[PDB]
Design a protein around this nucleic acid. Structure first.
Length: 97
RNA sequence: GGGAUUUCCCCAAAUGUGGGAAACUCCC
């Protein structure tokens, strides 16, 4: 657990993930992120606005110490499809990868 | 004949939920 969080890193506890399947469970990302720490919850979505077509979700970790590892393994596969991880806010700074 | 898994397309074209369509494997 972080000893000195701020309302700026508080939002980083939530990462945005994309290229997810159209029906993958929120549960299937938690057992996957179990390799980068421990996760609090997941939020699947069905809005497209892009070629991923309902293929996105959000993931919230119980601690920030899981955040930098969750973004580092990015590009792994789950339930038959590749998945990406970006912090919701640093999504644009992480797009340089 | 029924049930389970993923995929693709349109408005805009990568975010907290529009709609439609396609394929494989598995179970009864």
């Amino acid at each position: 657990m972080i000893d000195n969080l701020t309302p700026e890193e508080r939002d980083a506890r939530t990462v945005f993930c994309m290229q997810l399947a159209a029906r993958i469970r929120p549960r299937d990302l938690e057992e996957f992120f179990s390799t980068v720490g421990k996760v609090r919850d997941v939020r699947m979505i069905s809005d497209r606005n892009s070629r991923r077509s309902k293929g996105i979700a959000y993931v919230e970790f119980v601690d920030v110490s899981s955040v930098p590892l969750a973004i580092g393994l990015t590009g792994q596969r789950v339930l038959g499809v590749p998945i990406i991880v970006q912090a919701s806010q640093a999504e644009k700074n992480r797009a340089a990868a």
